[PDB]
């Protein structure tokens, strides 16, 4: 009730910044998440008994994959935390609640393979969900855990508020399907520059929350260079593994996933930053100005990758 979580000073201070790294100590991540909830939302938003129980069941349902794991779950949620804290008059009570949970759950039960690979493998999830295959699985897993005896952190909400916060969460999680992001940022670009962007339009809020989600999901390109560079090892470990499985199906993988083209990774990072990361945080800064640090950090890392190519490291 009047029981709040504290962090060491350095963590207390650095956690408010966008570029915070949650550290190598797995056991502090749940305290870190609860801390962000109490500060983003209130000591009252969730019952501490239930939240802790939900947090730990979620953690257990992330797999020990190189990148799409429990560390990613909490990292993406922290980015959301910082976007919300730098924009706190813009979001409803319900949006603060459901967005931080959405981020923690957004990759539940990920196996480290793309929607594309499930589809070429003919995995049963590809028959159950034709588009955004993994992302619909994630939201389904989320509802699963929410219905475990003792786990419904939303029990105090009215019938109507409950239906809203699940609908926030669901759209939020589908949004992390990067295949949808390009269309969403383009509509957001037009609306912003023709002045028709209206945050009181619910369908506009949806688009904005979507972009927030892409921004949080890719936040590893907005960390300090040594974090970004080591996170890249984890992503390619998954990519190259999936490429190995593509070869096992008798398919040449895209170079992104072919581990015989390690040498061309810096150039591949360059195009990604140009085609995705920079446009994403640009458009996000245009809508939510206090999120400028993400664009500045992304740009800085773009600059580091050009240096890697030029043989300056
Ligand atoms: O454009 C890309 N992919 C999108 C387009 O539609 C999906 C892309 C293309 C890439 N070509 C290469 C590459 C080329 C030649 C030789 C070797 C490698 N490497 C890539 C990485 C990429 N992407 C990410 O590194 C990436 C990173 C992350 C998290 C860190 C934030 C999440 N998702 C990602 O896809
Ligand atoms: Mg995902
Ligand atoms: Zn993710």
Curated annotation (Swiss-Prot):
UniProt-annotated binding residues for a divalent metal cation 2: 107
Q: Where does the record place it?
A: Cytoplasm, Cytosol
- Keywords, ordered alphabetically: Allosteric enzyme, cAMP, cAMP-binding, cGMP, cGMP-binding, Cytoplasm, Disease variant, Hydrolase, Metal-binding, Nucleotide-binding, Phosphoprotein, Repeat
Let me know which tissues express this protein, per UniProt: Abundant in the putamen and caudate nucleus regions of brain and testis, moderately expressed in the thyroid gland, pituitary gland, thalamus and cerebellum.
Positions annotated to bind 3',5'-cyclic GMP:
68, 269
Q: What is the UniProt domain comment for this protein?
A: The tandem GAF domains bind cAMP, and regulate enzyme activity. The binding of cAMP stimulates enzyme activity. Composed of a C-terminal catalytic domain containing two divalent metal sites and an N-terminal regulatory domain which contains one cyclic nucleotide-binding region.
* Full protein name: cAMP and cAMP-inhibited cGMP 3',5'-cyclic phosphodiesterase 10A
């Amino acid at each position: 009730g009047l029981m709040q979580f504290t962090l060491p000073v350095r963590l207390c201070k650095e956690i408010e910044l966008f570029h915070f790294d949650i550290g190598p100590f797995e056991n502090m991540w749940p305290g870190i998440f609860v801390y962000m909830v109490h500060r983003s939302c209130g000591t009252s938003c969730f019952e501490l008994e239930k939240l802790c129980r939900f947090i730990m069941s979620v953690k257990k349902n992330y797999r020990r994959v190189p990148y799409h794991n429990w560390k990613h779950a909490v990292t993406v949620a922290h980015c959301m935390y910082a976007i919300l804290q730098n924009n706190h008059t813009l979001f409803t009570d319900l949006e603060r609640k459901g967005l931080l949970i959405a981020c923690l759950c957004h990759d539940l039960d990920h196996r480290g393979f793309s929607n594309s690979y499930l589809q070429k493998f003919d995995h049963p999830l590809a028959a159950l969900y034709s588009t955004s295959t993994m992302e619909q699985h994630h939201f389904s897993q989320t509802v699963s855990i929410l219905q475990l005896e003792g786990h419904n952190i939303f029990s105090t909400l009215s019938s109507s508020e409950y239906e809203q916060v699940l609908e926030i969460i669901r759209k939020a999680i589908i949004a992390t399907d990067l295949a949808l992001y390009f269309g969403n940022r383009k509509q957001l670009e037009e609306m912003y520059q023709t002045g028709s962007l209206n945050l009181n339009n619910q369908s506009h809020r949806d688009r904005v929350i979507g972009l927030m989600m892409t921004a949080c999901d890719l936040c590893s390109v907005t960390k300090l260079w040594p974090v970004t560079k080591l996170t890249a090892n984890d992503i390619y470990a998954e990519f190259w593994a999936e490429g190995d499985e593509m070869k096992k199906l008798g398919i040449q993988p895209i170079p992104m996933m072919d581990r015989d083209k390690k040498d061309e990774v810096p150039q591949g990072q360059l195009g990604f930053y140009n085609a995705v990361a920079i446009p994403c945080y640009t458009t996000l800064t245009q809508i939510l100005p206090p999120t400028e640090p993400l664009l500045k950090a992304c740009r800085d890392n773009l600059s580091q990758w050009e240096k890697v190519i030029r043989g300056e490291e």
